Amino acid sequence: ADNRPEKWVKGVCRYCGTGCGVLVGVKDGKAVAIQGNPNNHNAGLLCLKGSLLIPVLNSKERVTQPLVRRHKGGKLEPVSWDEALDLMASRFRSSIDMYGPNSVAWYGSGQCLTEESYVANKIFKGGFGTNNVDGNPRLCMASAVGGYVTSFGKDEPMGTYADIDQATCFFIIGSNTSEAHPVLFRRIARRKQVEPGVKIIVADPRRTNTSRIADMHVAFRPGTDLAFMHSMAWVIINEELDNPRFWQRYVNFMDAEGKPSDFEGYKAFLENYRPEKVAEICRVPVEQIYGAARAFAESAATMSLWCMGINQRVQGVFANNLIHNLHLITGQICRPGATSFSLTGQPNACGGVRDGGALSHLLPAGRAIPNAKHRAEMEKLWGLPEGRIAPEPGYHTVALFEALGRGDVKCMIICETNPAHTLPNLNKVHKAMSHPESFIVCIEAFPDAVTLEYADLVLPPAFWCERDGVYGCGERRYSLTEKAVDPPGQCRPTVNTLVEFARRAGVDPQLVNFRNAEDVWNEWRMVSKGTTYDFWGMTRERLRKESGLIWPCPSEDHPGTSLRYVRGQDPCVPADHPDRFFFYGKPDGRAVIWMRPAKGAAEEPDAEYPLYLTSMRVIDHWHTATMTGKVPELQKANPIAFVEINEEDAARTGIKHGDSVIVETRRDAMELPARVSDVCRPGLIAVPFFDPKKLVNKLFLDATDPVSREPEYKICAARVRKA
Ligand SMILES: Nc1nc2c(c(=O)[nH]1)N[C@H]1C(S)=C(S)[C@@H](COP(=O)(O)OP(=O)(O)OC[C@H]3O[C@@H](n4cnc5c(=O)[nH]c(N)nc54)[C@H](O)[C@@H]3O)O[C@H]1N2
Ligand SMILES: Nc1nc2c(c(=O)[nH]1)N[C@H]1C(S)=C(S)[C@@H](COP(=O)(O)OP(=O)(O)OC[C@H]3O[C@@H](n4cnc5c(=O)[nH]c(N)nc54)[C@H](O)[C@@H]3O)O[C@H]1N2
Ligand code: SF4
Ligand SMILES: [O-][Cl+3]([O-])([O-])[O-]
Ligand SMILES: [Mo]
CATH class of the missing domain: 3.40.228.10 (Dimethylsulfoxide Reductase, domain 2)
Known part of the structure; x- marks a missing residue:
């Protein structure tokens, strides 16, 4: 007998692409408990981060009103939603009006709900006529x-x-x-x-x-x-x-x-x-x-x-x-x-960005920008005039922030990512993000994201289970999350923020005919129908009862596909x-x-920079720590960045455990506490990237795979020395 949850609302963990089903216990419109969804693949089990999701949902440290920065390098100050939406809509429409559609971009995430990325992709590719849509799964x-x-x-x-x-x-x-x-x-x-x-x-x-x-x-x-x-x-x-x-x-x-x-x-x-x-x-x-x-x-x-x-x-x-x-x-x-x-x-790199093709060179449900049949398929489905979708790919992420710095991209939306922290080669990227003529709108739940330091406007978004939406995890499983609690303050569901923006920017209202995430899900269900991504059978009613379905799932009586x-x-x-x-x-x-030839890094160690340097996940912290950094128990063992150094290397070079060292690369130098152990094989060092006080992506090179344009964060050449 209780005080203590009156109802349990089925959803998905806000963290990894493991994609654990969660049940959020709510009492008096407030979240008070969490457990794992017994019926999802995880069979009732969560890790410590997922089990400590409720302090994050309930943190009062939130962006809860629209905020504007009147001048580059000024302070963010409150602004109404109607002033903010008008400012935003006018700016983008204006930039397209003077420079064409390729002056504007979307930079989104595999943490956005699938319905959020679907709408954004559609507003830009079929609304504005630019394929400048990308996102962090590219990384x-x-x-x-x-x-x-x-x-x-x-x-x-x-x-x-x-x-x-x-x-x-x-x-x-x-x-x-x-x-x-x-x-x-x-x-x-x-x-x-x-x-x-x-x-x-x-x-x-x-x-x-x-x-x-x-x-x-x-x-x-x-x-x-x-x-x-x-x-x-x-x-x-x-x-x-x-x-x-x-x-x-x-x-x-x-x-x-x-x-x-x-x-x-x-x-x-x-x-x-x-x-x-x-x-x-x-x-x-x-x-x-x-x-x-x-x-x-x-x-x-x-x-x-x-x-x-x-x-x-x-x-x-x-x-x-x-x-x-x-x-x-x-x-x-x-x-x-x-x-x-x-x-x-990420929880929704699969459903949101990959499957829904919300990258620069792609179109939804396996479709491709350079393929004319595909573009025409999409024009039919989106009720578009012929030839409206541009025939050439927009900027992939690395290129996109380079295009920002050159002033080729003048307006940018960042949604549920922290690029000023997680992009590689940060000194270059910080310069690009402070172009005196850029207009950067950030949709961001947490005041401490370093990216907000570059933002011209901030919109207050509904966080996690404060709205409904689908996440597609690593195994092709589409799981819904239902609204458990209201958003605080003036927070708004991004589906709605995206639709109101498009309308005010003169996008044809037929294009954003969506009241909620359920409306967008049905259009996307159709947009997938008869492709090998077909998930037409995953109705909202089915996804409310089920703890996920796995695609292909082409009809309502179809169980899904193993x-x-x-x-x-x-x-x-x-x-x-x-x-x-x-x-x-x-x-x-x-x-x-x-028969791919085996080569190596784009930056290999040499006599000057003799070490491989890498970067890695730590269990207690999710990426940039804007969320896990709000859970007291998640810092009890990792509050700060460090460097892992091999013990044979350390003994040879005179470095002792907990010593402060300078890690240095061609791009920057950074002092860090040394962990000495057998973790790193000889010749290798490693750094975490959760510490906003220690922006290690300042150290890493920018180099990308020529086919995927994914950066090589895992390898560059570094030297290590006592401070
Ligand atoms: N050196 C190095 N760098 C890396 C990597 C690496 O291995 N090494 N890994 C790369 C990889 S694989 C990835 S996935 C990226 C991830 O990098 P990011 O996506 O940049 O980092 P996160 O902290 O996940 O970003 C989530 C942001 O969304 C905000 N947020 C949370 N909820 C909401 C919401 O409802 N609405 C909005 N608008 N915002 C919200 C959070 O506060 C946070 O600022 O990092 C990459 N960066
Ligand atoms: N706790 C926590 N969990 C997460 C995340 C988080 O931020 N925190 N983020 C999620 C996301 S978005 C992602 S992408 C995953 C990332 O999760 P993983 O990729 O599994 O974790 P990483 O620490 O990036 O790196 C994996 C391993 O690749 C190794 N590696 C380094 N160099 C090389 C090489 O040359 N060859 C090979 N084969 N391996 C090498 C590193 O030593 C590292 O141990 O984690 C997800 N889950
Ligand atoms: S963080 Fe990942 S493994 Fe842990 S509960 Fe969430 S989805 Fe499951
Ligand atoms: O959306 Cl991708 O997983 O091709 O970066
Ligand atoms: Mo990732």
Whole structure:
């Protein structure tokens, strides 16, 4: 008996792309409890961050009114919503009127609700006529996208979290699952517990909590995991552990010039990547290439999981291709427990930005800007005049902030991201963000986001479960979150803020015909209908009862889809297809192995800057800490930034534990407390990025993958010295 929740409102955790279902306990219109949704994949379980979501919902440290900065370098001061919307709408309309539509941009996030990103994408691409829509997943998942699309012809994993319960080998690469995806790591750990014969290979330059359940920790040299995975393929082929029945029917080979090849040509390519040479290159024992290769191929079902150590890379797309190569040569795929599974970081990078194509070169539900059929498909669906969608991609994120600095982009909206903190090469980016003629509107829940220091107008948004909306997590699961409490003060749901803005900026009101997130969901449901992203069967009523549905889900009686590309399991494979699998993303239904040359970082260490420097997640802090920094118990072990230094390096160089050091790169220098340990393999150092007092992205280079344009945050060259 209670005082203490009167009702429980079903939703989704505000944090990771694990995408735990949550039940928010409310009493008297106020949130008082949280638990995990027993019916979602997480089966009632949350991590400590998710369990401490209620102090964040209830923090009075909020942006609760519209704010304006009258002059560049002035103080933010209160302003009405009607003054703010008019100022905003006039400014944008004006900029388009003088300079054309490409002077205005959207910079959004994988934390926005899918309905928020859908509306924004539509206002800009089909309303203003500019493809300047991008977002922070470009800094994260864009490499997993280029990898999946070139290997399979479609985006997203072909398996699910369920596959975890049935792998007997986990190949966990460039992923600190323990601290980035705690509930998922538990499911993996649980799997090894239930079945002790389960082999776990953790490949990562750093020895993290994740490696503590591994049978093998491959501490390779930063940048050499490509040569590693090629070497694995050499071993699998050399020891006849490959699956010819599979690759003969279901696989094409492209050579190092990206020209059609064959198995025989693959063998010959792989000759350049023998275990003995590669061991020397990777700085690992040769037995590890052999063990990893053998575990992977000989295991009854192998699942690979990776995150930012593979994506945040100039060879990002190719590294994803290389993981798919192993699953493709062995046919460890399209079977329960056997699958190539990219981990998604943000809660809604999948549904909001990837699936809904809210990047500069994309259009919703698998569509592409440079493809004329696609643009016309969208013009039909959006009731647009012919040729209204521009034929060329807008600015990707790095290019977008460069375009800002040059004054080519004059107006910008930032929504649920903190770019003045999380973009790479911050001294350059800060300069760009303070162009004396830029007009930067920030929609931002938290007064302490460093980005608000550059903003000309701030709009007060409804936070998390103060409004309703869908998040699509890493496993293709679309879960709704219902409104639990009212927003405080003058906070407003961004769907509505976006619609009122468009109307006032002269956008055709037929284009933003939306009263709520439910109206936008139905248009998007239609916009997906008959594409391989089809999620037409996920009605709002269905998503209120269900704890998520997994796409494809083409009708109301359809349960959703576990194994994509599988005959009889994926509704996109015709029931009378001749083969049991169909990688319909490719013209001939065959998936592609890519003989990608293994190179390295864009900035490799040398005599002057002898260390690899990296950057990483910590368990207690979500990104920029504007939310977790409000939970007293989440700093009890990580209040401040530090640098991890290898103990052999430290002993050699004279650096002792807790010593203050200067980390220095070509771009900046920064003093930090040193943690000395075996975490970093020799030659490597590491920094977290949660500390707004220690903006480590000032240190990192800006360099991007040429296909995905994802920055290489995971590697640059640094030197370390006593302060
Ligand atoms: N606690 C917490 N959890 C989160 C987040 C958070 O901010 N805090 N954010 C979420 C988001 S958006 C994301 S993207 C994920 C990120 O989660 P992860 O990518 O799993 O975590 P990271 O710490 O970025 O890095 C993963 C590992 O890549 C390694 N790495 C470094 N260099 C190399 C290399 O050359 N090759 C390889 N293979 N690996 C290398 C690093 O050593 C690191 O341990 O976390 C999600 N979950
Ligand atoms: N060095 C380095 N830098 C990195 C990475 C790295 O590995 N290394 N990782 C990159 C990756 S993978 C990612 S995902 C990015 C993430 O980087 P960001 O997205 O920039 O960081 P967050 O703190 O998640 O951004 C969320 C912002 O949204 C605000 N917010 C919360 N709720 C609401 C709301 O309802 N409305 C609005 N308008 N705002 C809200 C929060 O207060 C916060 O300011 O960082 C990237 N940056
Ligand atoms: S694992 Fe991620 S989604 Fe689940 S409770 Fe923890 S932070 Fe939230
Ligand atoms: O995951 Cl993306 O950066 O291609 O939206
Ligand atoms: Mo991310």
